Amino acid sequence: ISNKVDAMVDLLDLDGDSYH
């Protein structure tokens, strides 16, 4: 269950100039 809710909180946290 702790792994489930950690995956859940990870998923809810988921929501140049060119010279020489």
Q: Which is nearer to a second copy, 5 or 20 (CB)?
A: 5
4 or 20, CB closer to a second copy?
Answer: 4
Provide, rounded to whole angstroms, the least separation between the CB of residue 7 and a second copy. Answer: 6
- CA geometry: angle 8, 10, 13, nearest 5 deg: 110
Alpha carbon distance 13, 4 (integer Å): 14
- Footprint of a second copy (CB under 8 A): 1-2, 4-9, 11-13, 15
User: Beta strands of 1-20 (E only): which ranges?
Assistant: none
- As measured in angstroms, the least distance from the Cβ of 16 to a second copy is 34
